[PDB]
Design a protein around this nucleic acid. Structure first.
Lengths: 552, 1322
RNA sequence: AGAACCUUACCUGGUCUUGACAUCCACGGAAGUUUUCAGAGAUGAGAAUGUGCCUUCGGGAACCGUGAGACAGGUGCUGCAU
DNA sequence: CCCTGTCTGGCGTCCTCTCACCTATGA
DNA sequence: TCATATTATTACGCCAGACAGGG
């Protein structure tokens, strides 16, 4: 084929075949003419090398080349390699009725449905719309229907909502590693140009929303619609196939909304009042007469199913909070009240959904996963859980710990000037005292964050776990750990140079205090090594998955 | 004092450390390199003169003619840069070289030549550099990126562990020339020394010594010291210097002087060496078992019989001693082969050597280098004497000789370019010393061992390739030269030089397309140091250590600005203050510290000098004298950050920005961010699109000014003065007299580049930021470019941001945006698309440009004229027609008429047409000809008249010393004017002088306008081949929408999720909604805490802005404004700014306060930024709460959010990953040729590659039918997909699968081998 | 839906011939304004004023004059070509 | 003849987007 | 335009697999 212009961009195999035929014609003419021995030996040898270069180029000494120094691609190089026929056109194919766009959240969704734009929906479903238009009788020939959807008149959007309705689509994030990276949804049409994807499902795709893209595929035939609904639907994938752990675990905002909701404080509005049900618990929270965390005797009716498939009601007064009753309005019947009576971090909400799946089955667990996500988003919005510069509380004991460590390294180096100790024992003593001082700084800041709030109730003071914002983001397990909150308040440890050995002078400044120049440069050693490790580790991880699914 | 656009809006500058060295010109690498390449520099170094003095004078092989050189020159470019980008030509210059041919007679080395000839011949065109550091190669604007490669000169590398699988180290030594053959020495685990040349076969290394005319005895003289056995009274005693016994076991009885020194069994200690030196012990009698393992040094022959006793390098036995003792050779020289220190590596290599003399050594080297073809005396000697020893094919440069003498601890640094005997012998000696223990290896990441190539060096190497090809051509033509009938262009040819230099500037791995969407991105693509390219490492192979940051990067390479992905740490970006060494290394400034007092003199160092000295830290507290206020200070000695004394240091860092680059020193509060998020923040900050309304970062670092000036996107004033401000077309600046030349009266007319296409389809546009009649100074800015605001650098815009979860719409990293952001068009960016249409004559006649578009009805002839082509302007969308361009016979007509692509809208801003000389109808082509024709003359006369007006007044102005008669000077109006005599006393010939000016003005204007019409009157200017050349420039205006990507400066990426109404936003109690809600959960994990301090400090900045907006709106007399502005500019600790505000004339306070009512801009520098107490104190100057947190109500429910939230102003950027460039869908369209599967991409309307892991994921489910239609019906099988399309549109979802076509393609490709693959029984 | 002249296309005489009406060049004159004798009048001969928008000055656009032709003109014929 | 360095081949992540550039010769 | 037919750089890192060498 010619490219855009007036010349033909010729393939490499035409060069190979044209050389074999040029040489073969020369050899026939020389055997006609009775050339001497050395001429026809060179001629047959050039034909041998030409045939051997046509079949598998470069297996003989240095491969032939046309333009410019790059070798030209032979038949065996049309078969082998990453870009042969197996790995590029027979195992993986390019696919019609498919689309691709940037994802975004849309938290109003139920977890069996996803948002799909109107422009992509009218392009992916052109033949179904053509068939629907031809059934009604609005048009006659196929051309008329293609002009109608090329113009996009007022009547094809009702046709589109009547071809969408019960027709699942396969959403697919581009590095699909396990089977939960292709899931089938039902479309809900979107004014917009971005796929709205239900948030819980994101933890299956490893999909954040920092610029990600996903592909949509349409199951055309009827068996494929039934496979998308009965095997690949997103309600059907709620447990990861690698183990027994649920994969629709609530990820980050919703566990903060729950951890702020089901908690307590030693005095609030409506401390120790008594409530006749969870409905008036939410009514007291909404009207402005109690607080979301205020300990209260309620009367809850938990249904324990102790018989053989019969739900027995037991009603009692639990000493609980307001938020635990409001969250009890969403729990299905069979679970006991003690699943919400605690503080509900992330491990606790994961085993809440797991006990709901083991007891009440699939359908209450799907609808209860949605109600968890809705109430987590709503009370995280009502929480106003910001992050400030004052939330990262510096330990008051931090500077004296650093000065005691500086006195200790001064003692060790004064022994080093007088030669009492060895050099390796000096390096070991310095790394040991900076590890001990690091642990002491972490314990100072961790006490100063985990119990900083000290509020009185009707008299003398009484302490409790803190409502500091970074501490709830750490204790809830939403985002953060001990190490990250340690590096934002306490000293950020002893960073290591790329030699593999550690550096004897640590980074005594956290991020709330400023790092100076040398400390940031040592930090950049430690972080450039991590980025290089991930960006080169991913190739071995993918090649390991390939070898494993081809031995299986 | 300040300049006049500095007093417009002076940014509140935190920062305690006084800067001593201002920032160098940020494009100096590109400009200094290319100014080195083209410059007339006598003494030859470096440049084009080095190329001509290497290649010339050419003399042929005794052909008695010798073409020599005189001088070269570059003429004017025929196309200036703008019309060069428009047309598509290179931006080049013709290289006029004077060449002087002299031709000899017979027998004239000394005789005078018989004839000369000389001419200014023309070879090539070299592409000049634009004033901003760019090229224009073929219409497009490209940048050569500076390479980072291994220096020439010896390197002693180890490879300690991986080979031999036994933990035994090797030690190789590579002599890397700048041009020529590579010579490597290397041990092997048998402890033998091996040479290899150009990574070829392995020769035992002493053969190269035997190739340098060294006998075996001379080699053993070099690499071994002699132990002397004297034949004496009995048992052949030994000279013993006591150094040789260090650390060995006493095998025999060590006694002398009648005294037993050391007995057998104990090892010899250094106290025993002191005993032997104090007792003066040299000669001791040895047993016969001591010599029975040693090796002879030189040859010995039996004197009377006349034959050989033993060859050199022969081990000794007792009967050999009975041979040599009875002959009469009293001295025996043995080789001291210490197992600890002085190993016998050369001697065992000589035992491996199959050669004996020089000639067989050269024959074996020639059989290594060029195999098959025979090894004769002349051929092998010419090979080996031109491998390393001739000036043509082997040349360590000056850098190579400096590194080569420095790594061998030589004294000198300048020497000859070739090697010698002594250099190869010294490399072998240092390698042996490293094996013995003394001296150590070199590392390759050490930036003293790592040179930079730049534009001038790379273009000079390519130009030298072209010159050696043209000298082989000149040697060709001259021996076939007949004289005198040729002049020097039948010999020389302009083709190979131009071919080579356009090969490099067009298709190389470093001459690459400029990332141009941003002033930052231009100025940080020009400052780029790539490890890749020719002669360097590759992306997909290496490695771990070359991708990692080494302690010599401090102040030379940015540690944190490197692109994430497949090439991390290969594409390093250069630091802010780092220049380039004379040899090409990276030297960075330091402040010389003689004693306690840190001196303000600067001094540049590279990494092979930074190790020796002790260099302080940038921020170490020194007060009022330079004395370090502590008695101990953190420094770094040899790449090790350690704490040293007050008075030991020799250098200090210059300024605290100097570690990082110009991409990541624009991030305020860098020191509070993590390193990873600073990397992601700088790499995204390169990617910002220019918004429609540029908006001044409230929290900047003060480096915005230098980046916005030094990248040439703003129209910086060349000569200061006032202004005339016609400006609709050009800024016209009248020049003050001190900066103004005596002749060339002169006023500067700046060209503003209005709406045009960038390289990334963004819009580069300049707008004047000075009014009419306003003073400007030299170096001041006049026109704000893209993403600039009054000379600062405004990539994104500053918006009110709340940190809270808001109903899930900002879940992972999403961002929830009000409607006030999209109503104000405060991200509505402008994109420009160039679309070409050509009507080439493929076949069956030429194609045609006519509106008489076929089949298609009264839906073709619409946005066009009666003669075809889009009629300009208009609200064109997708599926429209721009250029009717269709042929007959292609009832056989078709529609190739270039239309508008699917999904885009826009306005036709410009239509260019340099078409096939004929595009015209009956007259538009010549209709506009007269328009431009009359235009030229008009301005031509106008300009003359403009100067004439100024000159006429000037005539009268000077008319005072020679006729001031006001009533006797207003005679003729447009006729003459001055008519008075003068004589002498004072020179008033001024009238005569100005008379010539006007006289020459009119005389030159005619000629100027004479060529104008000549140029005007023309078909059009372009190349041949292509016929119909119609380029149409659309300009889409994209706003913002759910799905775009925004980001701050700290690494906080986001896809804007919901575009809320104004009402539903979280409003504080004052009533203002917040603009953008981010998510707090990103902040504890991604440890980029700097965005919060930017949020609080931007809140304080707009607090001052709201306070000034109240004091100026509710208008107060300027005393209260200058008092509040003075309080705002004093504010807190000891800073550098304060202000001199009472000298702003009671109006420059008000113009400043007009430019501050949107918020007081604050410079928070990079590592010496604003502390937290100053943020709190500035939040107390404004009336804002000290915590940074305001209680916010909810727009939905009207009720307060508990636990007050953070609101502030973050500077958020819109990155050019827009969602309606990514949205794509395909049902059915076109496919490829070879395969039956769909095409790929978006510009090709193609479908999604359902790859391999998705097939494994469908196999993981039970999706057997979904996969079957996913690879047979939807993709490949042609009968299956046509039956499926008809089955769908009938209303029958059922597939008739069949077999994929690409599998039958597989069968024919396998079967086209000798392979019979089939398909068996039914 | 209006013939004294005009209208008017008809008759009688007196006259004009690139023309009463247009476009085009060439080159003579700014247009126009006023007034005189002969003649039925058409026309054929005189005296007064003006030079505006712009010129590396081979000149121009409005408005008269002359010659060349290209053309104008025709209420001339065919309503049985329309 | 069983260890053995040494040499030769054969791997090295998926998906996507933008741009430019394409054999010499020649009576 | 229409047949003529291939040369002057090196700088991955294991990891199997086959091969001449020698105690």
């Amino acid at each position: 084929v010619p490219l855009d212009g007036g010349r033909f961009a010729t393939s490499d195999l035409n060069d190979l075949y044209r050389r074999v035929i040029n040489r073969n014609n020369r050899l026939k003419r020389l055997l006609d003419l009775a050339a001497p021995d050395i001429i026809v030996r060179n001629e047959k040898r050039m034909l041998q090398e030409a045939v051997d270069a046509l079949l598998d180029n470069g297996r003989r000494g240095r491969a032939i080349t046309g333009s410019n120094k790059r070798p030209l691609k032979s038949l065996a190089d049309m078969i082998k390699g990453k870009q042969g026929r197996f790995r590029q056109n027979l195992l993986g194919k390019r696919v019609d009725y498919s689309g691709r766009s940037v994802i975004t959240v849309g938290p109003y969704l139920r977890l069996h449905q996803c948002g799909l734009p109107k422009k992509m929906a009218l392009e992916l479903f052109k033949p179904f719309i053509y068939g629907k238009l031809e059934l009604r009788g609005l048009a006659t020939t196929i051309k008329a229907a293609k002009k109608m959807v090329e113009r996009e008149e007022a009547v094809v959007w009702d046709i589109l909502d009547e071809v969408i309705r019960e027709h699942p689509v396969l959403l697919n994030r581009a590095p699909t590693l396990h089977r939960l990276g292709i899931q089938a949804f039902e479309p809900v049409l979107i004014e917009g140009k971005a796929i709205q994807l239900h948030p819980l499902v994101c933890a299956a795709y490893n999909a954040d929303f920092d610029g990600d893209q996903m592909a949509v595929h349409v199951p055309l035939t009827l068996e494929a619609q039934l496979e998308a609904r009965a095997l690949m639907m997103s309600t059907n994938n709620i447990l990861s196939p690698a183990n027994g752990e649920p994969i629709i675990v609530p990820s980050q905002d919703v566990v903060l909304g729950l951890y702020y909701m089901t908690r307590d404080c030693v005095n609030a509005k409506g401390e120790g009042m008594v409530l006749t049900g969870p409905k008036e618990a939410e009514r007291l929270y909404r009207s402005g007469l109690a607080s979301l965390h205020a300990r209260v005797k309620v009367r809850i009716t938990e249904y324990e199913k102790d018989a053989n498939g019969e739900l027995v009601a037991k009603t009692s007064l639990k000493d609980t909070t307001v938020g635990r009753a409001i969250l009890w309005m969403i729990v299905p019947k069979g679970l006991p009240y003690s699943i919400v009576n605690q503080a509900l971090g992330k491990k606790a909400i994961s085993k809440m959904l797991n006990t709901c799946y083991r007891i009440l089955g699939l359908k209450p667990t799907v609808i209860f996963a949605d109600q968890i996500m809705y109430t987590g988003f709503a009370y995280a919005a009502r929480s106003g859980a910001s992050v400030g510069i004052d939330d990262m509380v510096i330990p008051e004991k931090k500077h004296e710990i650093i000065s005691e460590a500086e006195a200790e390294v001064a003692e060790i180096q004064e022994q080093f000037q007088s030669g009492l100790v060895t050099a390796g024992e000096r390096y070991n003593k310095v790394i040991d005292i900076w590890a001990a001082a690091n642990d002491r700084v972490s314990k100072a800041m961790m006490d100063n964050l985990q119990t900083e709030t000290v509020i009185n109730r009707d008299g003398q003071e009484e302490k409790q776990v803190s409502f500091n914002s970074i501490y709830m983001m750490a204790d809830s397990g939403a985002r953060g750990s001990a190490a990250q909150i340690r590096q934002l308040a306490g000293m950020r440890g002893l960073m290591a140079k790329p030699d593999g050995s550690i550096i004897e002078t640590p980074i005594t400044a956290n991020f709330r205090e400023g790092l100076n120049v040398l400390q940031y440069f040592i930090s950049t050693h430690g972080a450039r090594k991590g980025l290089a490790d991930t960006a080169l580790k991913t190739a071995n991880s993918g090649y390991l998955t390939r070898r494993l699914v081809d031995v299986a | 004092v300040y300049s006049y656009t500095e007093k417009k809006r002076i940014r509140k500058d935190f920062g305690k450390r006084p800067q001593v060295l201002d920032v160098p010109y940020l494009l100096s690498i590109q400009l200094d390199s290319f100014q080195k390449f083209i410059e007339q520099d006598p003494e030859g170094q470096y440049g084009l003169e080095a190329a001509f003095r290497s290649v010339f004078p050419i003399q042929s092989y005794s052909g008695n003619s010798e073409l020599q050189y005189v001088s070269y020159r570059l003429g004017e470019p025929v196309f200036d840069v703008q019309e060069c980008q428009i047309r598509g030509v290179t931006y080049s210059a013709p290289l006029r070289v004077k060449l002087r041919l002299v031709i000899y007679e017979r027998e004239a080395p000394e005789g005078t030549v018989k004839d000369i000839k000389e001419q200014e011949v023309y070879m090539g065109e070299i592409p000049l550099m634009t004033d901003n550091g760019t090229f224009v190669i073929n219409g497009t604007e490209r940048v050569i990126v500076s390479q980072l490669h291994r220096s020439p000169g010896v390197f002693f590398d180890s490879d300690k562990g991986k080979t031999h699988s036994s933990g035994k180290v090797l030690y190789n030594a590579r002599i890397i020339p700048y041009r020529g053959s590579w010579l490597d020495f290397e041990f092997d685990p048998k402890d033998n020394l091996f040479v290899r040349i150009d990574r070829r076969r392995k020769l035992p290394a002493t053969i190269i010594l035997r190739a340098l005319n060294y006998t075996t005895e001379q080699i053993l003289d070099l690499f071994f010291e002699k132990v002397i056995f004297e034949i004496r009274d009995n048992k052949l005693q030994m000279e013993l210097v006591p150094e040789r016994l260090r650390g060995e076991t006493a095998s025999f009885d060590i006694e002398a002087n009648g005294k037993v020194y050391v007995e057998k069994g104990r090892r010899i200690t250094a106290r025993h060496i002191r005993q032997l030196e104090k007792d003066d012990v040299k000669l001791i009698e040895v047993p016969v078992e001591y010599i029975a393992g040693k090796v002879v040094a030189k040859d010995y022959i039996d004197e009377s019989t006349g034959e050989l006793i033993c060859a050199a390098n022969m081990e000794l036995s007792l009967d050999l001693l009975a041979k040599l003792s009875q002959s009469g050779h009293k001295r025996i020289e043995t080789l001291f082969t210490n197992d600890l220190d002085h190993g016998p590596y050369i001697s065992e290599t000589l035992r491996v050597d199959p050669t004996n003399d020089r000639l067989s050594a050269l024959v074996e080297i020639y059989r290594m280098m060029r195999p098959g073809e025979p090894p004769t005396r002349e051929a092998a000697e010419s090979l080996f004497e031109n491998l390393f020893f001739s000036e043509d094919r082997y040349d360590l440069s000056a850098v190579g000789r400096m590194k080569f003498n420095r790594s061998l601890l030589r004294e000198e640094i300048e020497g000859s370019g070739i090697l010698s005997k002594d250099d190869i012998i010294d490399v072998m000696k240092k390698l042996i010393d490293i094996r013995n223990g003394k001296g150590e290896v070199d590392d390759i990441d050490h930036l003293g061992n790592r040179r930079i190539r730049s534009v001038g060096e790379m273009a000079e190497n390519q130009f030298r390739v072209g010159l050696v090809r043209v000298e082989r051509a000149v040697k060709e033509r001259l021996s076939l030269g007949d004289l005198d009938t040729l002049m020097p262009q039948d010999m020389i040819n302009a083709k190979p030089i131009s071919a080579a230099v356009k090969e490099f500037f067009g298709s190389s791995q470093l001459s690459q397309f400029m990332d141009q969407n941003n002033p930052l991105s231009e100025i940080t693509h020009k400052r780029r140091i790539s490890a890749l390219g020719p002669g360097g490492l590759t992306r997909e192979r290496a490695g771990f250590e070359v991708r990692d940051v080494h302690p010599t990067h401090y102040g030379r390479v940015c540690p944190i600005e490197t692109p994430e992905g497949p090439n991390i740490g290969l594409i390093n970006s250069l630091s802010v203050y780092a220049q380039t060494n004379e040899y090409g290394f990276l030297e960075t400034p330091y402040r010389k510290v003689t004693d306690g007092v840190v001196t303000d003199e600067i001094h540049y160092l590279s990494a092979i000098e930074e190790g020796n000295y002790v260099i302080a830290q940038a921020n170490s507290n020194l007060d009022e004298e330079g004395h370090f206020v502590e008695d101990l200070v953190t420094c770094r000695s040899k790449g090790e950050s350690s704490l040293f004394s007050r008075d030991q240091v020799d250098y200090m860092d210059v300024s605290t920005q100097q570690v990082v680059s110009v991409g990541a020193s624009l991030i305020p509060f860098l020191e509070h961010d993590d390193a990873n998020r600073a990397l992601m923040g700088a790499n995204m900050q390169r990617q910002a699109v220019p918004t429609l309304r540029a908006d001044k970062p409230l929290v900047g670092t003060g480096m915005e000014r230098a980046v916005a000036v030094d990248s040439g996107v703003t129209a910086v004033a060349k000569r200061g003065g006032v202004v005339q401000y016609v400006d609709a077309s050009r800024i016209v600046i009248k020049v003050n007299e001190d900066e103004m030349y005596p002749g060339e009266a002169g006023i500067d007319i700046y060209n503003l580049t209005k709406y045009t296409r960038s390289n990334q389809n963004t819009c580069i546009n300049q707008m004047p930021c000075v009014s009419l009649g306003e003073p400007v100074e030299r170096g001041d800015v006049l026109a704000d470019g893209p993403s600039t605001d009054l000379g600062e650098l405004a990539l994104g815009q500053n918006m009110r941001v709340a940190f809270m979860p808001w109903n899930g719409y900002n879940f992972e990293d999403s961002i929830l945006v009000s409607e006030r952001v999209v109503q104000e068009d405060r991200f509505t960016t402008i994109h420009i698309q160039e679309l070409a249409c050509v009507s080439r004559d493929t076949k069956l006649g030429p194609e045609e440009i006519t509106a008489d578009i076929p089949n298609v009805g009264e839906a073709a002839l619409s946005k066009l004229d009666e003669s075809g082509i889009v009629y300009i302007g208009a609200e064109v969308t997708g599926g429209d027609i721009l250029v009717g361009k269709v042929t007959p016979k292609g009832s056989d007509v078709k529609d190739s008429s270039l239309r508008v692509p699917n999904g885009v809208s826009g306005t036709v801003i410009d239509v260019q047409v340099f078409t096939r000389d004929g595009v015209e109808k009956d007259k538009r082509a010549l209709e506009i000809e007269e328009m431009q024709l009359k235009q030229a003359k008009k301005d031509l006369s106008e300009e003359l008249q403009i100067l004439e007006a100024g000159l006429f007044s000037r005539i009268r102005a000077v008319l005072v010393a020679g006729g001031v008669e006001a009533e006797k000077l207003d005679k003729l109006p447009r006729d003459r004017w001055l008519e008075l005599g003068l004589t002498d006393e004072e020179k008033q010939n001024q009238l005569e002088q100005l008379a010539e000016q006007y006289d020459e003005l009119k005389h030159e204007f005619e000629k100027k306008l004479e060529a104008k019409r000549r140029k005007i009157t023309q078909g059009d200017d372009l190349a041949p081949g292509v016929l119909k050349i119609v380029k149409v420039y659309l300009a889409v205006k994209r706003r913002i929408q759910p799905g775009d990507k925004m980001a701050g400066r700290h690494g906080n990426k986001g896809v804007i999720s919901k575009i809320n109404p104004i009402e539903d936003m979280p409003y504080d109690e004052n009533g203002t909604p917040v603009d953008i809600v981010l998510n707090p959960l990103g902040v504890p994990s991604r440890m980029n805490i700097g965005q919060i301090l930017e949020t609080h400090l931007g809140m304080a900045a707009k607090g001052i802005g709201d306070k000034i907006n109240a004091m100026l709106k509710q208008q107060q007399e300027v005393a209260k404004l200058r008092e509040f502005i003075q309080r705002a500019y004093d504010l807190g600790a000891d800073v550098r700014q304060k202000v001199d505000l009472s000298t702003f004339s009671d109006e420059e306070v008000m113009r400043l306060a007009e430019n501050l009512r949107k918020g007081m801009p604050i410079a928070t520098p990079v590592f010496d930024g604003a502390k937290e107490a100053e943020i709190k104190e500035l939040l107390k100057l404004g009336d804002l709460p000290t915590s940074g947190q305001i209680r916010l109500y909810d727009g939905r429910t009207g009720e307060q959010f508990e636990r007050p939230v953070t609101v502030g102003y973050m500077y958020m950027l819109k990155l050019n990953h827009l969602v309606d460039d990514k949205m794509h869908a395909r049902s059915t369209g076109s496919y490829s040729l070879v395969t039956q599967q769909p095409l790929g991409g978006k510009a090709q309307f193609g479908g999604q590659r359902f790859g391999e892991m998705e097939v494994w994921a469908l196999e993981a489910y039970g999706a057997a039918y979904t996969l079957q239609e996913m690879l047979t019906v939807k993709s490949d099988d042609v009968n299956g997909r046509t039956k499926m399309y008809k089955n769908i549109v009938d209303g029958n979802h059922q597939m008739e699968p069949g077999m994929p076509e690409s599998f039958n393609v597989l069968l024919k490709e396998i079967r086209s081998l000798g392979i019979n693959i089939e398909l068996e029984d039914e």
